[PDB]
Design an enzyme around this catalytic site. Structure first.
Site, PDB file in Angstrom:
ATOM      1  CE1 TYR D 172      -3.582   2.577   0.398  1.00 27.40           C
ATOM      2  CE2 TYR D 172      -2.720   3.082   2.591  1.00 27.40           C
ATOM      3  CZ  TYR D 172      -3.574   3.365   1.536  1.00 27.40           C
ATOM      4  OH  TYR D 172      -4.408   4.449   1.591  1.00 27.40           O
ATOM      5  CE1 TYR D 182      -2.134   0.162   5.819  1.00 27.83           C
ATOM      6  CE2 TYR D 182       0.239   0.617   5.793  1.00 27.83           C
ATOM      7  CZ  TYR D 182      -0.819  -0.207   5.505  1.00 27.83           C
ATOM      8  OH  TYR D 182      -0.576  -1.401   4.871  1.00 27.83           O
ATOM      9  CG  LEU D 220     -11.452  -4.854  -1.241  1.00 22.54           C
ATOM     10  CD1 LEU D 220     -12.310  -4.612  -2.507  1.00 22.54           C
ATOM     11  CD2 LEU D 220     -10.614  -6.145  -1.367  1.00 22.54           C
ATOM     12  CB  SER D 222     -10.454  -6.658   3.194  1.00 21.24           C
ATOM     13  OG  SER D 222      -9.541  -5.796   3.867  1.00 21.24           O
TER      14      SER D 222
END
Ligand SMILES: NC(=O)c1ccc[n+]([C@@H]2O[C@H](COP(=O)([O-])OP(=O)(O)OC[C@H]3O[C@@H](n4cnc5c(N)ncnc54)[C@H](O)[C@@H]3O)[C@@H](O)[C@H]2O)c1
Ligand SMILES: NC(=O)c1ccc[n+]([C@@H]2O[C@H](COP(=O)([O-])OP(=O)(O)OC[C@H]3O[C@@H](n4cnc5c(N)ncnc54)[C@H](O)[C@@H]3O)[C@@H](O)[C@H]2O)c1
Ligand SMILES: NC(=O)c1ccc[n+]([C@@H]2O[C@H](COP(=O)([O-])OP(=O)(O)OC[C@H]3O[C@@H](n4cnc5c(N)ncnc54)[C@H](O)[C@@H]3O)[C@@H](O)[C@H]2O)c1
Ligand SMILES: NC(=O)c1ccc[n+]([C@@H]2O[C@H](COP(=O)([O-])OP(=O)(O)OC[C@H]3O[C@@H](n4cnc5c(N)ncnc54)[C@H](O)[C@@H]3O)[C@@H](O)[C@H]2O)c1
Ligand SMILES: O=Cc1ccc(Oc2ccc(Cl)cc2Cl)c(O)c1
Ligand SMILES: O=Cc1ccc(Oc2ccc(Cl)cc2Cl)c(O)c1
Ligand SMILES: O=Cc1ccc(Oc2ccc(Cl)cc2Cl)c(O)c1
Ligand SMILES: O=Cc1ccc(Oc2ccc(Cl)cc2Cl)c(O)c1
Lengths: 287, 287, 287, 287
Positions: D172, D182, D220, D222
């Site tokens: 990423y 993050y 996404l 997830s």
């Protein structure tokens, strides 16, 4: 002015830490050395015996002013983190207050707040192995000593730093392009250091107005460099042959850039990897 | 003892060229201005009427000193390049020795060799148009004036510079990441300038021991910036809100970096793009 | 059902354009060649005399099929751009509808809308000269033919392409790292092309849902490569010796990547420079 | 043909591992899942109960062919590495042969040599903390699980792979540009993964002729993404608003790129970070 710089990672006069100390000294910055405990007593002995005297001359007028020299191990964040084997080691046994937090507290207690911080250290127990053959413990040691140590240094030192303070570390271009020989996860550790420099620049800039950058240095025949597998002899010869600037790269060439990045002159620069390598990084094909 | 810098691209006191002049003057570098003929006579009249006197104050115990101010057009490499129409144009007709080769010769004749050179100029006829709608002529104009001018400046000035001299230009991050509004092929020109800085670093480093780098500056409300359309107000607001360092970016912030890169302190740095933008370039997603 | 690709920049069977044609043909894409007028009649005569028959063999149970072959000059955007001299030149005099806008119109009139576009061309009058010695006219020629041509191709072809269409060009790593010998402003042009690929990705993605990327290819002994001077033999030898993958780089290696990028399989990739060079770009120091 | 792919890091049908499985399945690749032991029994139960049946449909003709599903923990290189607490855990107690080496041996014993390897996993126990507030144990956990696991996977799996095999992982853009949120050293781990991808490409390419690349995916929703601090809701909304391509990014968009990189079609690509993110990485300033 009362500028004080802690330099973590001086073991003798042959590495980048010493060159950075020398150049800061020219600007009348007070210097404190953080010395890895296994080499602390040897360093102090060489110093006392005058081994470093010629290396301390700045010029006609000036000698390096070293404010203090303290044992410092970037392996350990706090007193609690030291294992039995280390505390029992002959060389650590006669020393104390050498963890990251303890050194921050000690400097602040003796000298007050500082405004410059240099991370000039790395270690990787499996450096002599290819990345593919590096063990989990070996790889994590590289990252722990060479990358996480920067984060911990920031975390504990920001409490004792003034607003508008500045921090630097040293990296190598193996993070970005493949250098066979640069094993044990050192390449990985340097990639993480360069990324962490950015993320820390965001946190430290927004919260404390403190800057952090990293200098990607070219090859220098330091003690550590000797440990990589005449790997350093090769790198130096190649750099002096193929770099845009064909001149010997000196520790003080990196020192003068460090001094600039640690001063207010570079107040608009943060989160950057600055190359100080005679331009070698820009080349694709040897000519 | 005789640091002399030619700054190509000053038209007033509101841009980066002036900020670079001010910081260099601080270090006792003698400065020579290269002024584009369309703005040259208005510049001189303002200067003579003392309009810039306040702007020349360094610390009120020190004021800028300017060695010379010369008409200069980076569109023309030699006298033989000047079309008859320009030669006879209302604003050019009274001026002489304004091509790149002529100004280098003139400077040399008057002051001897120099050791510092600043390219602080750009231009593009169709900057208001998005790249997709930029014409061939507009795109080539942007490359001609903004990128090729650097190569030509180097070609002619290397003959009047001492070994170990240093050259800098200014660039913008739209070369590397998409900036809507930076049109007319200016993004293309800056990408070229940054690539040419590397190739030139190789030739100049190897053949003349001369260094060249470029500063990627953050936004400044200069005359040229305002003319893009508002675009610059958005850039500045965005930068002050989201950069790691939330402080007003000053022309002298760039100036002090330029000063370092032009000095011998940066002797092992060449071929580099150095970001001076409060760290904005390191961010992906805003807060 | 009706994938059609225009390939701009095929002059023989020895370059990347042919390799791209072959791989696309494998996937039943109909291919239209855009052939530069200086080589157009020799190309057609060779084709007609069956000189390319062996080169058109895919697996000997399948051979390339070519929908059309059109004279094409990426120097000219519209009919109104063509100077009288070119129009009447021995090689152009017998040809028509060879400008970027005319070929787009012609293609549309004959086959309707297309969905794949390949820019596989470059040119530079002074490629044999190092950047420092390249003239303004030479440098602008390189940018005009090698970089601007892509923007113009996009501007005129987007009107005859379906949404979700894809565009690719070819670049070389000399844009990012110094390659001695890649002269005449070709390095500058490739840096511009790579930057323009991003800006175009933004405009084309947002306005037309069209993707654009560029392939940075390794060395191939094409006709253009040989004309650089030998330069290409050294590049190839170096690449086969030092790349992570020590295997002969084929035009069809590029072709298969091009085929992927032009297909719907790459629907979330745009604005990218994709390296297809056996991994050579990742290396810093040789063995 | 006998293509077999081991996919390490499938926990349900909502992540990238599943999308890669689906796309490979279209190419008739036999698929083996490596499932983290804490979620292995839940996965098997959902599978048996038909929860995944609609997610397995490729089209009118085809259903996903899953060859096997095995417990797999990237925390442990060999049987000896499992600690007491884990072996005693309710969920691990009823499983066996789930270390990296054991899984390699098991696959090879049951199915022979494979030719495709997917690393689609990450973990970081302190992801919810800022880098500055991440502990040494937290940071090293991120690197151990998310970065070193790739090296170990390669080290043990190359013995059971054919020449010309291919390996991919997922990264990423937070490794390269700051993404607040993050945390826990995930940014660091991804920087190390991208660098390691290059170094491994050199070792695996020269020694075994095996390729390795990494796909930098966009956001996404997830299971793992849910754990970051509506951080994922924000990222998705921002990507769909500001990316060049305004379309929902699907797991199978990454799957189709993975399938290409794992096939012989991409034989000249190695050591690369390929962006599959609708072009968001190319943007500087939101428009
Ligand atoms: N020498 C080069 O060619 C070169 C090139 C690029 C970057 N660098 C970087 O410069 C920095 C300084 O290295 P150098 O080249 O000056 O070699 P050096 O040996 O002079 O400096 C490294 C120092 O780090 C110290 N150290 C090791 N482990 C430590 C720990 N756990 N805690 C505290 N200190 C520890 C050692 O005592 C040593 O003095 C390193 O980070 C290195 O990666 C060096
Ligand atoms: N202002 C910003 O926000 C910003 C941000 C990044 C980079 N830069 C760069 O900094 C440099 C200086 O721009 P600025 O912002 O100071 O605006 P500015 O107006 O202060 O500088 C432009 C100057 O260049 C001169 N010039 C234009 N064409 C010329 C030619 N053909 N020959 C000689 N001189 C010519 C003009 O007279 C003008 O004085 C530019 O290259 C620009 O790309 C500016
Ligand atoms: N060959 C290599 O080693 C290599 C390596 C990296 C990138 N590339 C790139 O691949 C592309 C193709 O080059 P190549 O190596 O296949 O050589 P090539 O000779 O096969 O391709 C060049 C073609 O472009 C055409 N062309 C030139 N000027 C034109 C114009 N104004 N209008 C229309 N067509 C024109 C020529 O007719 C020629 O057929 C080039 O853009 C090159 O930069 C090549
Ligand atoms: N989802 C995104 O937005 C996104 C964006 C970029 C990259 N990625 C990357 O894609 C990869 C897949 O993640 P995802 O988004 O599909 O989420 P996911 O939860 O679907 O996949 C992650 C999987 O890794 C497994 N795992 C965790 N720790 C493990 C260990 N110690 N050993 C073995 N397996 C372990 C988990 O069981 C989980 O199934 C990750 O590497 C992630 O960094 C995801
Ligand atoms: O020539 C390039 C070079 C030489 C030395 C370096 O420092 C180290 C390298 C490995 C280890 Cl374990 C420790 C250190 Cl300080 C380095 O980072 C890069
Ligand atoms: O905010 C970013 C910014 C603002 C101004 C700039 O300078 C110019 C931009 C366009 C033209 Cl035509 C001429 C010049 Cl000097 C620039 O390069 C970047
Ligand atoms: O080996 C690398 C290489 C070889 C050839 C190339 O193509 C050209 C290079 C110069 C000119 Cl003028 C025209 C073309 Cl098609 C290229 O771009 C890179
Ligand atoms: O939106 C970006 C994004 C979302 C999810 C991701 O995966 C993880 C993130 C953190 C942890 Cl601990 C584990 C995983 Cl699999 C990721 O890498 C990036």
């Amino acid at each position: 002015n009362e500028d004080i710089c802690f330099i973590a990672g001086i073991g003798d006069t042959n590495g980048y830490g010493w060159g950075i100390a020398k150049e800061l000294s020219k600007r009348n910055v007070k210097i404190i050395f953080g010395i890895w405990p296994p080499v602390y007593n040897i360093f102090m002995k060489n110093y006392k015996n005058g081994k470093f005297d010629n290396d301390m001359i700045i010029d006609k007028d000036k000698k390096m002013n070293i404010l203090d020299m303290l044992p410092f191990d970037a392996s350990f964040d706090t007193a609690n983190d030291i294992d039995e084997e280390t505390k029992n080691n002959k060389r650590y046994n006669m020393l104390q207050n050498y963890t990251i937090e303890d050194v921050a507290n000690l400097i602040h207690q003796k000298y007050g707040k500082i405004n410059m911080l240099v991370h000039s250290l790395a270690n990787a127990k499996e450096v002599q192995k290819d990345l593919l053959n590096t063990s989990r413990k070996g790889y994590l040691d590289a990252l722990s000593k060479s990358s996480y140590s920067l984060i911990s240094l920031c975390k504990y030192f920001v409490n004792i730093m003034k607003p508008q303070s500045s921090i630097i570390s040293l990296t190598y271009h193996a993070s970005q392009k493949v250098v066979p020989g640069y094993g044990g996860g050192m390449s990985s550790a340097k990639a993480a250091l360069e990324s962490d420099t950015r993320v820390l620049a965001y946190h430290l800039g927004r919260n404390y107005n403190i800057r952090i950058n990293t200098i990607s240095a070219g090859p220098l025949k330091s003690r550590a460099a000797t440990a990589i597998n005449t790997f350093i002899d090769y790198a130096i010869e190649y750099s002096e042959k193929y770099a845009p600037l064909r001149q010997k790269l000196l520790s003080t060439d990196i020192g003068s850039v460090a001094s600039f990045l640690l001063s207010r002159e570079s107040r608009a620069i943060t989160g950057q990897t600055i190359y100080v390598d005679n331009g070698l990084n820009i080349m694709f094909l040897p000519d």
